[PDB]
Motif scaffolding. Structure first.
Motif, PDB file in Angstrom:
ATOM      1  N   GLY A 137       0.761  -1.210   0.000  1.00 12.19           N
ATOM      2  CA  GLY A 137       0.000   0.000   0.000  1.00 12.19           C
ATOM      3  C   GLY A 137       0.805   1.280   0.000  1.00 12.19           C
ATOM      4  N   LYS A 138       2.118   1.211  -0.155  1.00 11.81           N
ATOM      5  CA  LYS A 138       2.910   2.429  -0.150  1.00 11.81           C
ATOM      6  C   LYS A 138       3.614   2.675  -1.458  1.00 11.81           C
ATOM      7  N   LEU A 139       3.525   1.759  -2.427  1.00  5.35           N
ATOM      8  CA  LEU A 139       4.141   1.935  -3.756  1.00  5.35           C
ATOM      9  C   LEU A 139       3.059   2.465  -4.678  1.00  5.35           C
ATOM     10  N   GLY A 140       3.049   3.769  -4.883  1.00  7.97           N
ATOM     11  CA  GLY A 140       1.995   4.359  -5.694  1.00  7.97           C
ATOM     12  C   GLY A 140       0.633   3.988  -5.145  1.00  7.97           C
ATOM     13  N   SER A 141      -0.324   3.768  -6.049  1.00  7.87           N
ATOM     14  CA  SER A 141      -1.663   3.336  -5.668  1.00  7.87           C
ATOM     15  C   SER A 141      -1.875   1.843  -5.901  1.00  7.87           C
ATOM     16  N   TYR A 142      -0.789   1.089  -6.063  1.00  7.99           N
ATOM     17  CA  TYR A 142      -0.884  -0.317  -6.398  1.00  7.99           C
ATOM     18  C   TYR A 142      -1.211  -1.157  -5.165  1.00  7.99           C
ATOM     19  N   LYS A 143      -1.850  -2.292  -5.410  1.00  6.88           N
ATOM     20  CA  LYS A 143      -2.124  -3.306  -4.387  1.00  6.88           C
ATOM     21  C   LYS A 143      -1.423  -4.567  -4.888  1.00  6.88           C
ATOM     22  N   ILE A 144      -0.221  -4.846  -4.402  1.00  8.83           N
ATOM     23  CA  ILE A 144       0.594  -5.931  -4.930  1.00  8.83           C
ATOM     24  C   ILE A 144       0.289  -7.229  -4.179  1.00  8.83           C
ATOM     25  N   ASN A 145      -0.233  -8.228  -4.899  1.00  6.02           N
ATOM     26  CA  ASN A 145      -0.677  -9.494  -4.314  1.00  6.02           C
ATOM     27  C   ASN A 145       0.058 -10.708  -4.870  1.00  6.02           C
ATOM     28  N   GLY A 146       0.861 -10.536  -5.908  1.00  6.69           N
ATOM     29  CA  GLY A 146       1.406 -11.698  -6.574  1.00  6.69           C
ATOM     30  C   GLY A 146       2.513 -11.254  -7.499  1.00  6.69           C
ATOM     31  N   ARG A 147       3.144 -12.251  -8.123  1.00  3.99           N
ATOM     32  CA  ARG A 147       4.240 -11.977  -9.044  1.00  3.99           C
ATOM     33  C   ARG A 147       4.396 -13.147 -10.021  1.00  3.99           C
ATOM     34  N   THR A 148       5.253 -12.907 -11.012  1.00  8.59           N
ATOM     35  CA  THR A 148       5.703 -13.956 -11.904  1.00  8.59           C
ATOM     36  C   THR A 148       6.672 -14.883 -11.189  1.00  8.59           C
ATOM     37  N   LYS A 149       6.924 -16.035 -11.812  1.00 10.98           N
ATOM     38  CA  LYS A 149       8.122 -16.818 -11.538  1.00 10.98           C
ATOM     39  C   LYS A 149       9.365 -15.988 -11.839  1.00 10.98           C
ATOM     40  N   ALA A 150      10.510 -16.483 -11.375  1.00  7.07           N
ATOM     41  CA  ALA A 150      11.754 -15.768 -11.666  1.00  7.07           C
ATOM     42  C   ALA A 150      12.245 -16.106 -13.066  1.00  7.07           C
ATOM     43  N   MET A 151      12.672 -15.098 -13.789  1.00  2.00           N
ATOM     44  CA  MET A 151      13.315 -15.278 -15.096  1.00  2.00           C
ATOM     45  C   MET A 151      14.811 -15.194 -14.890  1.00  2.00           C
ATOM     46  N   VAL A 152      15.497 -16.313 -15.028  1.00  2.00           N
ATOM     47  CA  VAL A 152      16.955 -16.342 -15.024  1.00  2.00           C
ATOM     48  C   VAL A 152      17.380 -16.101 -16.462  1.00  2.00           C
ATOM     49  N   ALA A 153      18.151 -15.042 -16.696  1.00  5.67           N
ATOM     50  CA  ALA A 153      18.502 -14.621 -18.034  1.00  5.67           C
ATOM     51  C   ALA A 153      20.003 -14.446 -18.227  1.00  5.67           C
ATOM     52  N   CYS A 154      20.461 -14.867 -19.392  1.00  8.65           N
ATOM     53  CA  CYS A 154      21.854 -14.732 -19.786  1.00  8.65           C
ATOM     54  C   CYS A 154      21.950 -14.052 -21.137  1.00  8.65           C
ATOM     55  N   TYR A 155      22.732 -12.976 -21.209  1.00 10.99           N
ATOM     56  CA  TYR A 155      23.188 -12.458 -22.489  1.00 10.99           C
ATOM     57  C   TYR A 155      24.556 -13.054 -22.720  1.00 10.99           C
ATOM     58  N   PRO A 156      24.729 -13.929 -23.705  1.00  7.45           N
ATOM     59  CA  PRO A 156      25.967 -14.714 -23.812  1.00  7.45           C
ATOM     60  C   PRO A 156      27.050 -13.970 -24.572  1.00  7.45           C
ATOM     61  N   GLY A 157      27.332 -12.757 -24.142  1.00 14.72           N
ATOM     62  CA  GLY A 157      28.346 -11.973 -24.809  1.00 14.72           C
ATOM     63  C   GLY A 157      27.976 -11.754 -26.267  1.00 14.72           C
ATOM     64  N   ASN A 158      29.008 -11.655 -27.108  1.00 17.32           N
ATOM     65  CA  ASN A 158      28.817 -11.557 -28.545  1.00 17.32           C
ATOM     66  C   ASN A 158      27.976 -10.372 -28.970  1.00 17.32           C
ATOM     67  N   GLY A 159      27.933  -9.335 -28.146  1.00 15.69           N
ATOM     68  CA  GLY A 159      27.200  -8.163 -28.493  1.00 15.69           C
ATOM     69  C   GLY A 159      25.706  -8.265 -28.333  1.00 15.69           C
ATOM     70  N   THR A 160      25.207  -9.321 -27.698  1.00 11.58           N
ATOM     71  CA  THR A 160      23.772  -9.468 -27.462  1.00 11.58           C
ATOM     72  C   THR A 160      23.282  -8.381 -26.489  1.00 11.58           C
ATOM     73  N   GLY A 161      22.018  -7.997 -26.656  1.00 14.56           N
ATOM     74  CA  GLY A 161      21.377  -7.023 -25.806  1.00 14.56           C
ATOM     75  C   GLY A 161      19.890  -7.047 -26.019  1.00 14.56           C
ATOM     76  N   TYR A 162      19.244  -5.950 -25.694  1.00 10.33           N
ATOM     77  CA  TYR A 162      17.775  -5.872 -25.770  1.00 10.33           C
ATOM     78  C   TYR A 162      17.453  -4.441 -26.196  1.00 10.33           C
ATOM     79  N   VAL A 163      16.821  -4.288 -27.344  1.00 13.36           N
ATOM     80  CA  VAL A 163      16.483  -2.969 -27.851  1.00 13.36           C
ATOM     81  C   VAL A 163      15.584  -2.238 -26.843  1.00 13.36           C
ATOM     82  N   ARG A 164      15.514  -0.914 -26.993  1.00 13.18           N
ATOM     83  CA  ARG A 164      14.702  -0.111 -26.078  1.00 13.18           C
ATOM     84  C   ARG A 164      13.247  -0.575 -26.075  1.00 13.18           C
ATOM     85  N   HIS A 165      12.707  -0.753 -24.885  1.00 16.61           N
ATOM     86  CA  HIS A 165      11.359  -1.276 -24.715  1.00 16.61           C
ATOM     87  C   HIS A 165      10.781  -0.907 -23.358  1.00 16.61           C
TER      88      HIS A 165
END
Lengths: 219, 20
Positions: free
Chosen positions: A98-126
């Motif tokens: 009840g203190k983060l903005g007006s949100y009511k946080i009750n749940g979440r996703t599973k954890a995403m374990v992520a690897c950028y395997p070098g080689n110039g990999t990344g993620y465009v602006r989003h």
């Protein structure tokens, strides 16, 4: 560190003023290295698959995001310290009720374990959640002991709306990051030139997530 | 404009979700 004070005296005001909050040295060296070993074992045993997008059209996913990921619930054998991380993140969020903005946080996703395997990999602006899918807070833990971003890249650059500066988050060992998932925080993962790991969860706003689930269940 | 959902990282929409 004790969750109550960290949540109420740092994370909450940081988020409400800036929409971004960095907590360094979150779990300590021993636990951080144990998480690293667990992540490296998921990598070495072939668990990672190409990161995917909410909506898919003609494009290859790899022209958008070049990471490889797996989803972790927290209870799997060999992921016990990842589970401890997830429990620690959850503890902070529960102390923010009840203190983060007006949100009511009750749940979440599973954890995403992520690897950028070098080689110039990344993620465009989003934007993590541009169209109301329920996600309100993105929480990311970084685990790259020895990362030198000036050489290896991999900075998460966030462009918080309305600010005279962008926020460059190096993927530093034992760093925890929170940011609003909506259009206030467009962000890019700049090209990585060494193997880069991060573990993300997204926290849901109850009412928005309910609306999103209704949309999915009706078509 | 561009449909930003095409750049947004996927999450499962089915199943439950974890409850805090």
């Amino acid at each position: 560190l004790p969750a109550l004070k960290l949540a109420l005296e740092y994370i909450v005001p940081c988020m409400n003023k800036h929409g971004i909050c960095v907590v360094d040295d979150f779990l300590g060296k021993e636990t951080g290295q144990q998480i690293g070993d667990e992540v490296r074992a998921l990598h070495d045993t072939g668990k990672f698959t190409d990161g995917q997008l909410v909506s898919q059209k003609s494009d290859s996913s790899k022209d958008i995001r070049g990471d490889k990921i797996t989803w972790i619930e927290g209870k799997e054998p060999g992921c016990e310290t990842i589970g401890l991380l997830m429990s620690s993140m959850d503890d902070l969020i529960r102390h923010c009720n009840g203190k983060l903005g007006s949100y009511k946080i009750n749940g979440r996703t599973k954890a995403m374990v992520a690897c950028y395997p070098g080689n110039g990999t990344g993620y465009v602006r989003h934007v993590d959640n541009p169209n109301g899918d329920g996600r309100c807070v993105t929480c990311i833990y970084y685990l790259n002991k020895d990362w030198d971003a000036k050489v290896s890249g991999g900075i998460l650059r966030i462009f918080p709306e309305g600010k005279a500066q962008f926020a460059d988050i190096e993927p530093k060992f034992d760093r925890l990051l929170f940011f609003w998932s909506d259009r206030r925080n467009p962000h890019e993962v700049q090209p990585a030139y060494a193997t880069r790991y991060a573990i993300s969860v997204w926290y849901f706003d109850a009412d928005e997530r309910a609306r999103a689930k209704v949309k999915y269940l009706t078509g | 404009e561009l449909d930003l959902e095409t750049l947004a990282p996927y999450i499962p929409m089915d199943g439950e979700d974890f409850q805090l």
